[PDB]
Amino acid sequence: MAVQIGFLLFPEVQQLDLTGPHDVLASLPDVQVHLIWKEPGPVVASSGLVLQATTSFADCPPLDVICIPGGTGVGALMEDPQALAFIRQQAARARYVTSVCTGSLVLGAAGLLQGKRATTHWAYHELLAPLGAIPVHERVVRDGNLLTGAGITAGIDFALTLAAELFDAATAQRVQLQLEYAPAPPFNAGSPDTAPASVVQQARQRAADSLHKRREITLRAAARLAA
Amino acid sequence: SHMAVQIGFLLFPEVQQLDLTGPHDVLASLPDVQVHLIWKEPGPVVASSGLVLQATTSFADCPPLDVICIPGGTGVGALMEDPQALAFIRQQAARARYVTSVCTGSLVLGAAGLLQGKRATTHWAYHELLAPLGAIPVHERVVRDGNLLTGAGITAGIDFALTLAAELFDAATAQRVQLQLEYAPAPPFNAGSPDTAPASVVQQARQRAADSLHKRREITLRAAARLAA
Numbered sequence: 001m002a003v004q005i006g007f008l009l010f011p012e013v014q015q016l017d018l019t020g021p022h023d024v025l026a027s028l029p030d031v032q033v034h035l036i037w038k039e040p041g042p043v044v045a046s047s048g049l050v051l052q053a054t055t056s057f058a059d060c061p062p063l064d065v066i067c068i069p070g071g072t073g074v075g076a077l078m079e080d081p082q083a084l085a086f087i088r089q090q091a092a093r094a095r096y097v098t099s100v101c102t103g104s105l106v107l108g109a110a111g112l113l114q115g116k117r118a119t120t121h122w123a124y125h126e127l128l129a130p131l132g133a134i135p136v137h138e139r140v141v142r143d144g145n146l147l148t149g150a151g152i153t154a155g156i157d158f159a160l161t162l163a164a165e166l167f168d169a170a171t172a173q174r175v176q177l178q179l180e181y182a183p184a185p186p187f188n189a190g191s192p193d194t195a196p197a198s199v200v201q202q203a204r205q206r207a208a209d210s211l212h213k214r215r216e217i218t219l220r221a222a223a224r225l226a227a
Numbered sequence: 228s229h230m231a232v233q234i235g236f237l238l239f240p241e242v243q244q245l246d247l248t249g250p251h252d253v254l255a256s257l258p259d260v261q262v263h264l265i266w267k268e269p270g271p272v273v274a275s276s277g278l279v280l281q282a283t284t285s286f287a288d289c290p291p292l293d294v295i296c297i298p299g300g301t302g303v304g305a306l307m308e309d310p311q312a313l314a315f316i317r318q319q320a321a322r323a324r325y326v327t328s329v330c331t332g333s334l335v336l337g338a339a340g341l342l343q344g345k346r347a348t349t350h351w352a353y354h355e356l357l358a359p360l361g362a363i364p365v366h367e368r369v370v371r372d373g374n375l376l377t378g379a380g381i382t383a384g385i386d387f388a389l390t391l392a393a394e395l396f397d398a399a400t401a402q403r404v405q406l407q408l409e410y411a412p413a414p415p416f417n418a419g420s421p422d423t424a425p426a427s428v429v430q431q432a433r434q435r436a437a438d439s440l441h442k443r444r445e446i447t448l449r450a451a452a453r454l455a456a
Contacts, residue, residue, distance in 0.1 A: 016252040016408075019278070023245040023381075026276040033277070042281070047255035048262070049248070052271070052279040101409075122409055139413050151409025152252075153385065161415045173418035173428045179245075180330075180351055180380025182419030183412040184368045186390045189402035190411030199402045206407075 002032045003166060006063040006090065008083070008106075009035040009053045012073030015045035017100040017155050021067060024159035027175045028167060036060050038082070046072045057086045065162065066090045069155070070102030070121065075214055078109035078221050088112070096145050096162065100155040104148045105214070108133060109221040117143040121151035122192055123207045127214060130222045153190075156181065231261040232395060235292040235319070237312070237335075238264040238282045241302030244274035246329040246384050250296060253388035256404045257396060265289050267311065275301045286315045294391070295319045299330030299350065299381070304443055307338040307450050317341070325374050325391065329384040333377045334443070337362060338450035346372040350380035351421050352436045356447045361454070382419075385410065 005025055007018050018035075026033050037043055037053035044050050066087065077083045087110045091097045099107050104120045107113055108131025118133040119125070119141045128135040139150045140158050147165075149158030160181070164172040189195035195203075234254055236247050247264075255262055266272055266282035273279055295316065306312050316339045320326045328336050333349045336342055337360030347362040348354070348370040357364040363372075368379045369387045376394075378387030389410070393401035418424035421432075 014252070015248060019244060019248040022278060023243070023276055026278075035278075047252060049251060049255075049264075050281040052281075139411070140415070151407075153408045153410040153412065156382065157413055157415060164415065169416065170425075170428065173416050173424060174431060176414065176416055176418040177421065177424045177428055177432055178380075179382045180419060181382040181414055182368070182423065183382065183414070184386055185405065185410055185412070186369070186386060186393065187398065187402045187405055189405045190409060192406070194411065195402060195406045199399065199406055202399075202403050203406045206403075 002030050003028075003064045004032055004034070004061050005065045005067070006034040006036050006060060007067045007069060008087070009037050009043050009051055010071075010073045010077055010083070011043055012046045012071055013043070013051075013069050014071030014101060014152060015047060015049050015051065016152055017069030017071060017103065018051075020153065020155040021100065021159035024156065024163060024175060024179065027178065028163060028171065034060055034063075057082070060090070063090050063094050065096045065098060065166070066094050068099040068103035068106045070100060070105075070152070072210070074102045074105055075217050077106050078217050084110040094145070096147060096165070098147045098158070098162065100149040100158055101151045104128065104133075105131065105218065107148070108218075111225050112146070114225075116146050117141050118146065118148045119150045120148065123151070123204065124211060124214060127218045130218050132222075132225070228259050231259045232257070232293045233261055233263070233290055234294045234296070235263040235265050235289060236296045236298060237306075237316070238266050238272050238280055239302045239306055239312070240272055241275045241300055242272070242280075242298050243300035243330060243381060244276060244278045244280065245381055246298035246300065246332065247280070249382065249384040250329065250388035253385060253392060253404060253408065256407060257392055257400065263289060263292070265315075286311065289315075289319075291322060292319050293324045294395070295323050295326055297328040297332035297335045298384075299328070299332040299334075303331045303335055304446050306335050307446050313339045323374070325376055325394070327376045327387070327391065329378040329387055330380050333357070333362075334360065334447065336377070337447075340454050341375070343454070345375055346370050347375070347377045348379045349377065352380075352432065353440065353443065356443060359447050359451045
């Protein structure tokens with residue numbers, strides 16, 4: 001009867017995609033949160049922060065919510081048949097199938113975005129269409145029981161949105177107040193629409209090699225879905 | 228590299244993990260930074276939610292830090308009366324470029340004597356405990372006083388870390404990281420501050436926190452007496 005929430009915790013995850021939502025959702029009543037990988041034990045994030053998976057695929061209970069974070073490690077998962085099969089298995093009955101940032105590319109590689117409205121990190125948004133999604137430039141996108149959040153820190157907005165759906169608005173507001181989540185960013189550079197042009201150029205320049213490698217992975221993953 | 232900026236977070240039992248992991252992912256995005264997670268010994272440390280983190284160094288082996296950062300959480304009350312942790316904080320603060328905290332981590336800085344006559348903030352529900360530790364309490368989300376930088380409650384860590392990034396590097400670098408993080412927040416509700424949340428929500432929360440507040444007040448006044456002697 002406790003709500004069972006599971007995050008996929010994989011090597012080279014972007015940890016904040018996971019730890020932001022985790023601290024929001026673990027604050028709710030009658031929940032249990034699992035960190036899932038092929039085996040329990042240490043998993044190292046892209047920054048070198050060490051996290052700890054609490055369950056293997058086999059011992060994971062049926063999930064009410066599955067959540068896929070993003071990160072450098074997404075590329076490997078998009079061509080990992082075990083991970084994709086596990087995600088499909090849990091998505092079949094999950095009340096909600098969800099992701100943050102480039103985690104939606106993993107959902108796409110699993111076939112779960114076909115015909116659905118979805119978002120991802122702004123720098124990788126062009127990769128949603130080949131995976132079958134209708135790409136939407138909004139920070140949290142809901143299509144039926146699929147909820148996708150945009151890049152990294154969107155996980156906090158996503159998790160508060162999810163909290164209200166699992167419980168109600170008042171419960172989500174209580175958690176928002178406990179987290180003192182009234183952001184006041186010191187700059188206005190969080191979106192390519194508002195950041196200075198020089199900043200956008202540098203961020204795009206840094207992401208270019210990753211984007212090219214992910215363009216190639218995405219087209220192989222899409223071709224497998226088609227065949 | 229061996230010229231890296233050395234950033235250290237105190238990692239303690241019953242920490243509020245987001246106070247640490249939010250800033251960590253921001254600051255680890257900067258060029259040539261090394262981040263340490265510091266406790267009495269290396270090894271696993273369990274956060275208040277059950278998330279397991281891993282300390283990378285002991286107090287004794289930690290190198291001189293450029294930045295020390297104290298997160299908050301249920302575990303702060305113990306730290307405020309831990310002579311070994313307070314001695315480490317004071318030692319590192321003697322030479323750090325920036326002495327910093329998030330959320331109730333500032334009460335630990337206060338217990339260490341580092342807020343006397345200094346402007347500071349903390350989580351909104353515990354803000355009254357700043358003044359007995361000698362601080363000038365400021366109701367702002369990120370507060371600077373010289374090389375001291377304190378963030379307000381939990382999620383303020385992200386705003387704090389981008390502010391610190393601009394001081395360590397420059398505004399252009401902090402903006403790039405903000406864009407890489409897609410940090411253009413759009414909260415689904417407006418209940419992040421006691422001034423904007425529904426009154427019924429603020430009341431419920433004060434009702435919940437009252438016991439912790441009375442317990443932390445007594446610890447706070449004991450810690451203040453130790454500074455006075």
